[PDB]
Design an enzyme around this catalytic site. Structure first.
Site, mmCIF file in Angstrom:
data_model
loop_
_atom_site.group_PDB
_atom_site.id
_atom_site.type_symbol
_atom_site.label_atom_id
_atom_site.label_comp_id
_atom_site.label_asym_id
_atom_site.label_seq_id
_atom_site.Cartn_x
_atom_site.Cartn_y
_atom_site.Cartn_z
ATOM 1 N N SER A 4 -1.284 -7.948 10.963
ATOM 2 C CA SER A 4 -2.714 -8.030 11.154
ATOM 3 C C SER A 4 -3.424 -8.058 9.821
ATOM 4 C CB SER A 4 -3.213 -6.836 11.990
ATOM 5 O OG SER A 4 -4.659 -6.832 11.861
ATOM 6 N N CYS A 58 2.006 5.970 9.067
ATOM 7 C CA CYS A 58 1.175 6.185 7.877
ATOM 8 C C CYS A 58 0.262 7.408 8.060
ATOM 9 C CB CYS A 58 0.305 4.924 7.592
ATOM 10 S SG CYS A 58 -0.756 5.162 6.092
ATOM 11 N N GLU A 104 -0.160 -0.487 16.698
ATOM 12 C CA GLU A 104 -0.960 0.694 16.310
ATOM 13 C C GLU A 104 -1.931 1.034 17.415
ATOM 14 O OE1 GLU A 104 -4.521 1.796 13.256
ATOM 15 O OE2 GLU A 104 -2.899 0.610 12.470
ATOM 16 N N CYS A 109 0.828 -1.205 0.000
ATOM 17 C CA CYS A 109 0.000 0.000 0.000
ATOM 18 C C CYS A 109 0.860 1.252 0.000
ATOM 19 C CB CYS A 109 -0.835 0.008 1.303
ATOM 20 S SG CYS A 109 0.308 0.066 2.728
ATOM 21 N N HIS A 127 3.159 1.930 11.866
ATOM 22 C CA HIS A 127 2.055 1.752 12.869
ATOM 23 C C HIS A 127 1.824 2.897 13.785
ATOM 24 C CE1 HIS A 127 4.511 -1.689 11.845
ATOM 25 N NE2 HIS A 127 3.337 -2.170 11.414
ATOM 26 N N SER A 180 2.071 -5.171 3.580
ATOM 27 C CA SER A 180 3.477 -5.072 3.997
ATOM 28 C C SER A 180 4.420 -6.046 3.228
ATOM 29 C CB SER A 180 3.582 -5.303 5.536
ATOM 30 O OG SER A 180 2.768 -6.408 5.928
HETATM 31 C C1 LIG Z 1 -0.475 1.236 9.828
HETATM 32 C C2 LIG Z 1 -0.747 -0.211 9.742
HETATM 33 O O1 LIG Z 1 -1.226 -0.744 10.775
HETATM 34 C C3 LIG Z 1 -0.425 -0.998 8.539
HETATM 35 C C4 LIG Z 1 1.048 -1.099 8.235
HETATM 36 C C5 LIG Z 1 1.413 -2.047 7.138
HETATM 37 O O2 LIG Z 1 1.125 -3.437 7.425
HETATM 38 P P1 LIG Z 1 1.668 -4.216 8.654
HETATM 39 O O3 LIG Z 1 2.995 -3.669 8.933
HETATM 40 O O4 LIG Z 1 1.601 -5.657 8.222
HETATM 41 O O5 LIG Z 1 0.748 -3.819 9.918
HETATM 42 P P2 LIG Z 1 -0.525 -4.559 10.458
HETATM 43 O O6 LIG Z 1 -0.068 -5.577 11.497
HETATM 44 O O7 LIG Z 1 -1.343 -3.499 11.120
HETATM 45 O O8 LIG Z 1 -1.352 -5.194 9.361
HETATM 46 S S1 F3S Z 2 -2.303 -0.829 5.412
HETATM 47 FE FE1 F3S Z 2 -3.349 1.151 5.471
HETATM 48 S S2 F3S Z 2 -3.096 2.458 7.288
HETATM 49 FE FE2 F3S Z 2 -1.444 3.012 5.857
HETATM 50 S S3 F3S Z 2 0.352 1.643 6.069
HETATM 51 FE FE3 F3S Z 2 -0.951 0.712 4.549
HETATM 52 S S4 F3S Z 2 -2.290 2.418 3.789
#
Ligand SMILES: CC(=O)CCCOP(=O)(O)OP(=O)(O)O
Ligand code: F3S
Length: 309
Positions: free
Chosen positions: A226, A96, A126, A12, A74, A269
């Protein structure tokens, strides 16, 4: 065996920005560059960056005075940012922008002394960072994960209550929590739907479409991501065997023996080179050319700060 690719899948805008922030800091300042938490929850990205001189820490007390510290995608609590801010550290923030949006709302509620409820998973970085924007002892900040958590919550003043969410939740499970919140607390204020980001919503929509065609789904992503876990879960609830894998070596031959249609996606990610290697392995195991499904277009980019161009 036919190989189908979910669309969208993979990086993303927040993850591309956060990785670029670390890479560019390394290129401008050299090693070491300290990073608070895995910059994103991907074992390949984090090992790559380590090998180039990034040092990943959990606590600020692990970073030497005068060091360059980057916060991960996060986000971090006010206490963390003040602990860095009080020390000698040059900070770049890879949080982000879509997490920062949520933090600004929690900060607004705290300043009003009005109570907030966050929907999210306990112990997730987060959630720590977002709960960590609320400081007013006269209000309160509560975490709920499920309808049952909503059913047991009691608050000081339910006429002045708002809610926020973690960005990488299940859209469906979150909808059920929001329905419970509004039934329990009919005056509660929030966004139209949730704070789940475009990338999470779109990859879940894409894996649903993939699982409707594929007998088995492979989700490229790490165990502690997640959003990648939500993609596997969603295919599993549709009754498809689904596996979360870090890379092609994880693929067990039994999972695809006799399978006529295997689908592959990737969390927000996970870099595309991992998906390419998974596709290469499924090909050795009898798959043909990978066919990308038609999908919702994504067009958002978030730039690195000008300091790091
Ligand atoms: C700001 C976020 O929570 C998404 C970050 C990108 O993914 P990831 O690092 O895998 O984080 P999540 O464990 O929240 O999916
Ligand atoms: S999963 Fe979503 S919250 Fe930001 S880091 Fe990626 S656009």
């Amino acid at each position: 065996m036919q190989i189908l690719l979910a669309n969208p899948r993979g990086f993303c805008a927040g993850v591309d920005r956060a990785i670029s922030i670390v890479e560019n800091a390394l290129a401008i300042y050299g090693a070491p560059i300290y990073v608070r938490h895995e910059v994103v929850h991907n074992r390949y990205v984090v090992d790559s960056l380590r090998e180039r001189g990034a040092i990943f820490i959990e606590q600020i007390s692990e970073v030497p005075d005068g060091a360059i510290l980057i916060f991960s995608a996060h986000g971090v609590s006010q206490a963390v940012r003040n602990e860095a801010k009080s020390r000698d550290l040059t900070v770049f923030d890879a949080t982000c922008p879509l997490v920062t949006k949520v933090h600004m709302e929690v900060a607004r509620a705290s300043r009003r002394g009005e109570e907030s409820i966050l929907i999210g998973h306990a112990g997730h970085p987060e959630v720590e960072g977002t709960m960590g924007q609320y400081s007013n002892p006269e209000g309160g900040m509560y975490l709920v994960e499920s309808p049952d958590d909503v059913w047991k919550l009691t608050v000081k003043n339910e006429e002045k209550l708002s809610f926020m969410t973690q960005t990488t939740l299940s859209v469906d499970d979150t909808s059920d929590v929001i329905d419970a919140l509004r039934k329990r607390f009919p005056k509660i204020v929030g966004p139209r739907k949730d704070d789940i980001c475009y990338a999470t919503t779109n990859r879940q929509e894409a894996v649903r479409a993939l699982a409707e065609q594929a007998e088995v789904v492979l989700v490229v992503g790490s165990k502690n991501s997640s959003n990648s876990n939500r993609l596997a879960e969603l295919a599993q609830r549709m009754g498809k065997r689904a596996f979360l894998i870090d890379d092609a070596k994880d693929i067990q031959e039994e999972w695809v023996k006799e399978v006529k249609c295997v689908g592959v996606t990737a969390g927000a990610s996970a870099p595309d080179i991992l998906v390419q290697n998974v596709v290469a392995r499924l090909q050795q195991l009898g798959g043909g050319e990978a066919i990308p499904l038609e999908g919702r277009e994504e067009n958002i980019v978030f730039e690195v700060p000008k300091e790091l161009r």
